[PDB]
Design a protein around this ligand. Structure first.
Ligand SMILES: [K+]
Ligand SMILES: [K+]
Ligand SMILES: [K+]
Ligand SMILES: [Mg+2]
Ligand SMILES: [Mg+2]
Ligand SMILES: [Mg+2]
Ligand SMILES: [Mg+2]
Ligand SMILES: [Mg+2]
Ligand SMILES: [Mg+2]
Ligand SMILES: [Mg+2]
Ligand SMILES: [Mg+2]
Ligand SMILES: [Mg+2]
Ligand SMILES: [Mg+2]
Ligand SMILES: [Mg+2]
Ligand SMILES: [Mg+2]
Ligand SMILES: [Mg+2]
Ligand SMILES: [Mg+2]
Ligand SMILES: [Mg+2]
Ligand SMILES: [Mg+2]
Ligand SMILES: [Mg+2]
Ligand SMILES: [Mg+2]
Ligand SMILES: [Mg+2]
Ligand SMILES: [Mg+2]
Ligand SMILES: [Mg+2]
Ligand SMILES: [Mg+2]
Ligand SMILES: [Mg+2]
Ligand SMILES: [Mg+2]
Ligand SMILES: [Mg+2]
Ligand SMILES: [Mg+2]
Ligand SMILES: [Mg+2]
Ligand SMILES: [Mg+2]
Ligand SMILES: [Mg+2]
Ligand SMILES: [Mg+2]
Ligand SMILES: [Mg+2]
Lengths: 181, 238, 46, 101, 336, 124, 393
RNA sequence: CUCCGCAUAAGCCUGCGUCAGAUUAAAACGAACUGACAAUUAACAGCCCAAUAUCUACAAUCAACCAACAAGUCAUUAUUACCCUCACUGUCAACCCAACACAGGCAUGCUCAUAAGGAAAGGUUAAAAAAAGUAAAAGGAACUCGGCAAAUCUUACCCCG
RNA sequence: GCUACCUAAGAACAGCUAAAAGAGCACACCCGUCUAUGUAGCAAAAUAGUGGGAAGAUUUAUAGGUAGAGGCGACAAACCUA
RNA sequence: GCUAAACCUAGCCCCAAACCCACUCCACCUUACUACCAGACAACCUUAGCCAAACCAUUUACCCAAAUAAAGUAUAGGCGAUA
């Protein structure tokens, strides 16, 4: 019920609520998918309750009791996602060999940049899609000059950064002259 | 620019069609003809200028009944709704065309010339010399392109070697094949050229914009020029 | 009469006149975006 | 779910199912007087009222009769020390009415 | 700016809110019959009601597919139209008033009134008094107007030991929305029409509020609310508009009650209501020392039939048909 | 005079603009004639929520738990744990051929499955 | 001849195919593998696509000739058809003879003052004022609004006479009913598909109007022709049709007999309203269609002079002008132009009122004309009442 | 006092709600400024439509008399296909375009003087010159380039178009 | 997105006289004749009064079109973001 | 005595060397940053002018692939300026 959005009524007003550790990737890697599926919702309901308490704390202009509880729940849920993702990624590689779940391709755009074009789902073939064909996946010669100017802009930035580091290394030897070795 | 001609309808109908004004602009959006703009909104009634158009499954001469003669905003002449068989179409009305009349659209050329009734469409070869004719085509089956304005009429001058010589309203002769179909009589609204605009505003209603105020000195082009009538224009190939 | 109020805002007009799609519709407009990208503009277009 | 691709549905296809949802909601105290049966939430922007009904019923077993939602504008008025506008994020508010008195 | 009150409403528990806006107490059952000092052919009436029911469902052949979402308008709406039309024709011998009555089809009914006050919370008008204004725009599927008023169900000063429900929040939470537009007080015809009094209204619930859908949305307990809310709002507007046609208003309260009846249906289940308007003094000023209350009587909805299979009407309920007939037989008391 | 820097949202622009732009909610149907929306049940995500009765795992873990080394799962490890034992056993029995690879769990094509790994056709 | 549709508006022709396709033994390198257009590769030739499943919102119907009901002979289908020659064309199509005025049998019903409605003139005047003035909140009700109501209220006024005539309780007014009837005229296949208006349905068939002597006397009458216009002008020439003969109700309907057909011409715009002659033609064809459907049901699909003629009435109005028709179907042997002919009694152009003023006409602060009906004619309602009372009083 | 006012559209985007800060409004402790916390809930509105063929001569104006020209905003049918339902978005304000809390600009409905919305004077004194008004003996254009201005409510001509 | 002209589809025009109207009187509305004030002003063209038109060649909201060797112009060398 | 004054870092410039270049999920050519439909439009084509010639009208240097030298030579040019 709606009581699950709030902590145990005995904990209301307590300055600190003790909590255990966040689940680790290795500990979760020993559990079955069904157990991880159930644990997700156990962690999910805890997250909602902690989010409810955090907002009410701001409403009342009071500090949230044990704010580290929320960080732990987020870390545990992030670890659970990673564990489940690893299992699906390994299965996809074995059965298909594809490194990514979503199809895509390397494309050049109207601005001459190389981009990874993530594919979208459609019901009609691409040669009949009016909106898709309006997109330009190629660059005309007038873009060439701009690509060079952008490359040169990058080169200047990189050159300044490298020269500055060398200057800083010399300032360091001046302050601490015993770093010759 | 994104100008699209309103003349997109492909199937003939007698329903007045919504038309879009140009303002004298071309497809580029630049003014191409000056002095055009505004005016009353108008709907286009599609006029069939091929008087001898037999119905899909029919052939040979056919008659039509005049249902109504009415004002047309898109042209000086009046137009007549005619019905024959299961088909209705707009045509140009003749001077004395009235509702209830019957008109004959024939393609038959006989040894003797027919008795020409006003409003009937016959081949030029079938008409007596001197008949007042209108809506004349240059080549057979092309459709009427001449003598279409209010009150205009031509005259059949000669008939030689399967050809007909017509006098155009401008008085310039016009040679055509005798099989080219024409309509007998003068076009409706004989008094069109007698209308008085009366005030500047009425020209604005007709979609005419005022002339430029720039003063132009007249040049050699101006002044009366007495020139010979141009040589007979011929559409027959020998 | 009094001037200075030439701007009569309209989102439809603003998007149509200076929008992203409009800019990309011609090579000159694409070059506009490329110049602004090279300068590092936060706003490439309206 | 949010920030995921939804499998495209075609007539006669399988039911779309989500197994581990990443929608997280917080029950908030109403700022104004509300009817006794009304419960206020702040839900993700991509969550529909249909999702919230099934979300509350499936996970929390809360019988829901009606759900209304609105999109609250977050202020973009504040300015940092660089005179750059600071955007308070927009959030969606849901109003859930209980179903059985 | 005024609140738009919809008689046919999706809002939960709207009947309780509508009672507050209209100062109406609701009573279960029908009004107490008056004890005061031609044969009715039940067989004939039942056959006409079954004939109409079978016509729309079976006999009348449809050129086009009738989809489920179209069923209310394509099937149910003609039924209630024809059912009301024939019954009044057959019942003219028993009730002479019906012969001269005006039968309208989907004619608007408008009522505008002021109930309560609020302090403007925000803006340049903050802190100033503003009247809470309401508008009902109703379209009864059918209605019957008469030139002579029906008799009151109870006395004008009738008192009941039942308090009118109160709301502890703004009307906007129902939800209810504000809009500004023409304020119409309309009984179904202009004031020039002699038939300025109301007899019976027949309402057809829309597909959006169909019984099947309310059960799917965990709203089983709102089924009867939907009927009650539509009855209270519709008849309050109709009787209210009738009173104002006679020159009464908040500062000149009605000197006699204004009664009307409503039949509410979804095409199968029928519910019967009676409304007595005892007071129009609903403004804060005029309601300060107003003991009068408006009264609405209502029955629980009952199915007129169970199923329809081919050309057979299964489980036809004679009691529901009799209740329709009883309202149509009501007539003004004849003066001496 | 327009604000170029602020996010473009459905709150901005005229009535037509405001109703065409959304907030990223996935559609669950289509509009029919008369602006009538048809909700598709199959397009609405169905929350598969498990029964949590007698479930022993709690939101947090005890601090008195021995630390372990992180070893991310790999395709090789999964194959060794799941597929290699069966292949090793049939190899000893003497009945092993490429034709039976489907017996050991290889899927030649993803088409025809409800949950297809690539392109992925199911939700997290 | 002039061809309609300028080329600039027509679909642009496909660009010239790349010349690599012409060379034999050469495989063009196209951008199909890249899945997007590039200017420097050849345009792929894509094979035709088929969705391969049913999507109702993206359906494409089969070619017209491949439809199961496609027939080489055309059926000319007649509520939206506006006949050019009006009644004359309708008279030919239905092989019927026209008698001006309503039958004496019908008109005698209202000559007795016992059949008159109490306060008839005032009652009818209130009906006009209601429909034209008091109906809505709008100052001036539009014809799409008052035209249906004025007919409904007049029927309601006539239905008040159930007291005097108990037989008026054996009829109902049905909405949304349709009927179809197919017959042949001079080898032309004709179909009337009736829809719209109200069908007054009775349990008992209407008494026959014309004696067997008048029916036989129609043999001499010759149907008038109107060359050069075809009898089928303004009909829908259809090449996909079913020879359907339908009364609009399934077998067993308690009120199977059509008594009156109330046809409305309620369009607000004058060009969208049938001319008086066109409305009378629609009434004749709809009355004939209803009668023919009944005859084909009761007496089979054979072609024969009917021993029991079928009588159907029709009332057509635009809200102010009323047309009255009594149609008797004497024969179903319609293919020939000679023999017993059907009979139609038509009373045309019956003005119920001349004009209605919704606002007072004030010239120089003087009310020249008051609000209300102008030129009310009670005789028009007397004919309306007589048609209603027919078969009951 | 009332120029309005209320609402819608367009535009704008939290821009006088709560709590607290002494930050400040061309003055001022109220706050439009700062920080935190609140809020606008769909019925109104936006977001619509299977295909192929086919159909659509007869304005509007109280649409009825009558007269028009500049000749007009509103329409289907046949066959095939079609079972499903109420999602999404807008909803705040003392507001917009004029560098401003600018005497300017700003579409539509209703109200036709109001039931709505407002305050011309920070206090004092009562010089000059200046601004806006009111009254004026006798005279009545003597003014002035000119009856400009004001007052009054007027005759007869001329040039040009 | 101002302005000149055009295109699409919209909206507004009380009362009185005449009842025919690019008719008269006169609101809303459009324009800006004359005087005064103002002149870093309330305003980079305004205010007050007085005026021209106000069913038309009228005014006006929305979207769109014509771009500088050019556009547009009832020619003022007008107007095309002070 | 106020207002102020004072500071040494942030980083930057010119060379050398070395070819250069991305990536979490989701969104983004339609009104970009917008899950989901019948299209088919497609890139190239001599720079000019200021300016110098004391006006100006032919003409008037612009990395184009080895520093140096041949050499400001041969040669070109209102045989002028200059190249
Ligand atoms: K003309
Ligand atoms: K704002
Ligand atoms: K100003
Ligand atoms: Mg023209
Ligand atoms: Mg000229
Ligand atoms: Mg000139
Ligand atoms: Mg500016
Ligand atoms: Mg503008
Ligand atoms: Mg909403
Ligand atoms: Mg709606
Ligand atoms: Mg508001
Ligand atoms: Mg300014
Ligand atoms: Mg006030
Ligand atoms: Mg003051
Ligand atoms: Mg003072
Ligand atoms: Mg002072
Ligand atoms: Mg004096
Ligand atoms: Mg003097
Ligand atoms: Mg004098
Ligand atoms: Mg002097
Ligand atoms: Mg003066
Ligand atoms: Mg002049
Ligand atoms: Mg136009
Ligand atoms: Mg006027
Ligand atoms: Mg005038
Ligand atoms: Mg004037
Ligand atoms: Mg002057
Ligand atoms: Mg203006
Ligand atoms: Mg001009
Ligand atoms: Mg000049
Ligand atoms: Mg000059
Ligand atoms: Mg400028
Ligand atoms: Mg020089
Ligand atoms: Mg010089």
């Amino acid at each position: 019920g709606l009581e699950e959005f709030f902590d145990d009524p005995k904990n209301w007003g307590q300055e600190k609520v003790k909590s255990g550790a966040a689940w680790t990737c290795q500990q979760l890697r020993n559990k079955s998918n069904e157990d991880l599926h159930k644990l997700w919702y156990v962690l999910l309901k805890e997250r909602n309750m902690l989010l409810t308490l955090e907002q009410e704390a701001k409403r009342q202009r009071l500090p949230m009791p044990s704010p580290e509880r929320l960080d732990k729940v987020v870390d545990s849920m992030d670890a659970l996602d990673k564990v489940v993702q690893e299992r699906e990624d390994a299965l996809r590689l074995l059965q298909t060999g594809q490194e990514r779940a979503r199809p895509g391709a390397w494309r050049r755009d109207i601005f001459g940049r190389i981009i990874w074009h993530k594919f979208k789902q459609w019901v009609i073939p691409w040669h009949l899609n009016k909106r898709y064909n309006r997109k330009r996946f190629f660059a005309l010669p007038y873009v060439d000059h701009f690509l060079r100017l952008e490359r040169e802009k990058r080169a200047r930035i990189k050159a300044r950064k490298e020269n500055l580091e060398r200057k800083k290394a010399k300032i360091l030897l001046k302050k601490f002259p015993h770093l010759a070795e | 620019a994104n100008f699209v001609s309103w003349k997109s309808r492909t199937k003939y109908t007698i329903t007045p069609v919504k038309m879009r004004k140009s303002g004298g602009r071309d497809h580029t959006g630049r003014i191409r003809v000056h002095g055009i703009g505004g005016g009353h909104k108008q709907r286009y009634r599609m006029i069939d200028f091929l008087r001898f158009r037999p119905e899909e499954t029919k052939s040979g001469p056919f008659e039509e009944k005049v249902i109504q003669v009415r004002y047309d905003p898109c042209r000086s002449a009046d137009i007549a709704l005619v019905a024959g068989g299961s088909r209705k179409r707009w045509i140009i009305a003749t001077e004395n065309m009235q509702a209830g009349d019957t008109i004959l659209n024939s393609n038959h050329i006989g040894r003797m010339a027919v008795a020409a009734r006003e409003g009937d469409a016959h081949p030029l070869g079938a008409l007596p010399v001197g008949t007042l004719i209108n809506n004349v085509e240059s080549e057979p089956g092309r459709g009427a392109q001449y003598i279409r304005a209010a009150g205009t009429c031509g005259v059949l001058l000669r008939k030689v070697n399967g050809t007909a010589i017509i006098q155009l309203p401008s008085k310039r002769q016009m040679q055509v094949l005798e099989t080219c179909v024409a309509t007998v009589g003068r076009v409706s609204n004989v008094d069109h050229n007698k209308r008085v605009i009366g005030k500047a505003g009425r020209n604005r209603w007709l979609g005419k914009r005022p002339n430029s105020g720039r003063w132009h000195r007249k040049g050699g082009w101006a002044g009366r020029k007495i020139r010979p009538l141009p040589p007979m224009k011929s559409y027959v190939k020998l | 009469k009094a001037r200075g109020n030439e701007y009569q805002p309209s989102n439809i007009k603003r998007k149509n006149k200076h929008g992203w799609v409009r800019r990309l519709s011609t090579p000159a407009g694409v070059q506009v975006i490329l110049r602004r990208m090279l300068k590092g503009r936060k706003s490439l277009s309206h | 779910a949010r920030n995921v691709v939804y499998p495209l549905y075609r007539l006669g296809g399988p039911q779309l199912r989500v197994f581990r949802t990443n929608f997280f909601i917080q029950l908030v105290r109403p700022g104004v007087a509300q009817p006794e049966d009304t419960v206020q939430f702040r839900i993700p922007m991509e969550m529909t009222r249909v999702d919230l009904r099934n979300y509350l019923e499936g996970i929390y077993n809360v019988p829901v009769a009606a759900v209304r939602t609105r999109v609250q504008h977050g202020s973009n008025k504040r300015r940092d020390h660089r005179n750059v506008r600071i955007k308070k994020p927009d959030y969606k508010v849901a109003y859930v009415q209980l179903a059985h008195g | 700016m005024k609140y738009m009150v919809y008689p046919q409403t999706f809002a939960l528990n709207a009947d309780r809110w509508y009672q507050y806006f209209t100062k109406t107490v609701f009573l279960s059952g029908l009004p107490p019959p008056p004890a005061e000092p031609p044969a009715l052919d039940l067989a004939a009436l039942r056959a006409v009601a079954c004939d109409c029911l079978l016509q729309e469902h079976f006999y009348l052949r449809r050129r086009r597919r009738v989809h489920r979402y179209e069923e209310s308008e394509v099937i149910s709406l003609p039924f209630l139209d024809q059912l009301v039309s024939t019954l009044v024709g057959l019942l003219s011998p028993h009730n002479p008033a019906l012969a001269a009555a005006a039968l309208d089809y989907r004619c608007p009914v408008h009522f505008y009134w002021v109930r309560g006050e609020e302090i403007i919370p925000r803006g340049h008008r903050r802190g100033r008094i503003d009247d809470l204004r309401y508008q009902i725009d109703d379209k009864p599927n059918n209605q019957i107007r008469i030139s002579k008023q029906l008799a009151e169900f109870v006395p004008l000063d009738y008192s009941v030991p039942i308090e009118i429900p109160t709301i502890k929040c703004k009307p906007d939470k129902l939800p209810l929305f504000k809009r500004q537009y023409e304020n119409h007080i309309f009984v179904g015809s202009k004031t020039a029409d002699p038939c300025c009094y109301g007899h019976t209204q027949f309402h057809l619930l829309p597909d959006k509020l169909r019984r099947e859908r309310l059960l799917r949305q965990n709203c089983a307990d709102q089924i009867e609310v939907v009927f009650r809310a539509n009855a209270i709002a519709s008849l309050f507007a109709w009787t209210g508009a009738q009173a104002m046609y006679q020159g009464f208003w908040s500062e000149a309260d009605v000197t006699r009650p204004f009664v009307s009846q409503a039949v509410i249906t979804d095409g199968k289940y029928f519910s019967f209501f009676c409304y007595q308007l005892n007071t129009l003094a609903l403004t804060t000023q005029a309601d300060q020392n107003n003991p009068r209350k408006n009264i609405c009587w209502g029955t629980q909805s009952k199915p007129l039939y169970e199923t329809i299979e081919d050309n057979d009407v299964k489980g036809f309920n004679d009691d529901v048909l009799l209740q329709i007939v009883h309202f149509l037989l009501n007539r003004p008391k004849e003066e001496k | 005079g327009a604000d170029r820097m602020s996010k473009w949202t459905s709150k901005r622009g005229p009535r037509s603009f405001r109703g065409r732009k959304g907030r990223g909610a996935k559609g669950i149907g289509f509009l029919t004639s008369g602006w009538r929306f048809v909700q598709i049940k199959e397009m609405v995500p169905e929350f598969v929520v498990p029964d949590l009765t007698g479930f022993k795992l709690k939101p947090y873990v005890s601090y008195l738990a021995p630390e372990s080394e992180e070893t991310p799962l790999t395709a090789a490890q999964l194959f060794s744990e799941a597929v290699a034992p069966a292949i090793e056993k049939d190899f000893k029995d003497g009945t092993f051929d490429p034709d039976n690879l489907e017996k050991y769990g290889f899927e030649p094509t993803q088409e025809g499955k409800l949950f297809q790994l690539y392109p992925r056709n199911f939700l997290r | 001849a002039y061809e309609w549709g300028v080329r600039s508006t027509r679909k642009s022709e496909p660009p010239p195919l790349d010349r690599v396709y012409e060379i034999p033994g050469l495989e063009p390198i196209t951008f199909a593998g890249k899945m997007h257009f590039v200017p420097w590769l050849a345009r792929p030739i894509f094979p035709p696509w088929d969705r391969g499943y049913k999507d109702p919102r993206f359906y494409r119907s089969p070619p017209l000739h491949e439809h199961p009901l496609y027939k080489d002979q055309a059926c000319y289908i007649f509520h939206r058809c506006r006949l050019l020659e009006g009644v004359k064309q309708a008279l030919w199509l239905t092989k019927t003879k026209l008698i001006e005025g309503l039958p004496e049998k019908v008109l005698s019903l209202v000559d007795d003052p016992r059949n008159h409605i109490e306060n008839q003139d005032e009652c009818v005047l209130n009906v006009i004022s209601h429909a034209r003035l008091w109906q809505t909140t709008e100052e001036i009700p539009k014809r799409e609004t008052y035209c249906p109501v004025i007919v409904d209220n007049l029927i309601q006024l006539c239905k008040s006479q159930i007291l005097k005539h108990p037989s008026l309780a054996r009829r109902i007014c049905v909405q949304n009913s349709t009927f179809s009837a197919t017959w042949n005229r001079e080898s032309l296949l004709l179909q009337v598909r009736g829809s719209g208006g109200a069908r007054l349905s009775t349990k008992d068939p209407l008494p026959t109007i014309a004696s067997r002597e008048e029916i036989e006397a129609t043999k001499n009458h010759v149907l008038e022709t109107f060359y050069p216009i075809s009898p089928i002008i303004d009909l829908h020439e259809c090449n996909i049709y079913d020879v359907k003969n339908d009364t609009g109700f399934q077998e067993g309907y308690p009120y199977p007999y059509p008594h009156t057909l109330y046809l409305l011409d309620k369009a607000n715009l004058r060009p969208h309203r049938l001319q008086p002659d066109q409305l009378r033609a629609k009434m004749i064809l709809f009355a004939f269609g209803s009668a023919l459907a009944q005859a084909r049901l009761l007496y089979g699909n054979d072609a024969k002079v009917l021993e029991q003629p079928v009588v159907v009435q029709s009332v057509g109005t635009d809200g102010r002008v009323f047309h009255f028709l009594v149609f008797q179907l004497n024969t179903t042997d319609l293919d020939c132009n000679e023999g017993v002919k059907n009979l139609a009694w038509v009373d045309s152009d019956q003005l119920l009122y001349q004009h209605f003023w919704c606002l007072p006409v004030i010239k120089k602060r003087v009310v020249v004309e008051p609000v209300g009906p102008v030129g009310f004619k009670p005789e028009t309602f007397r004919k309306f009442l007589a048609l209603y009372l027919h078969g009951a009083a």
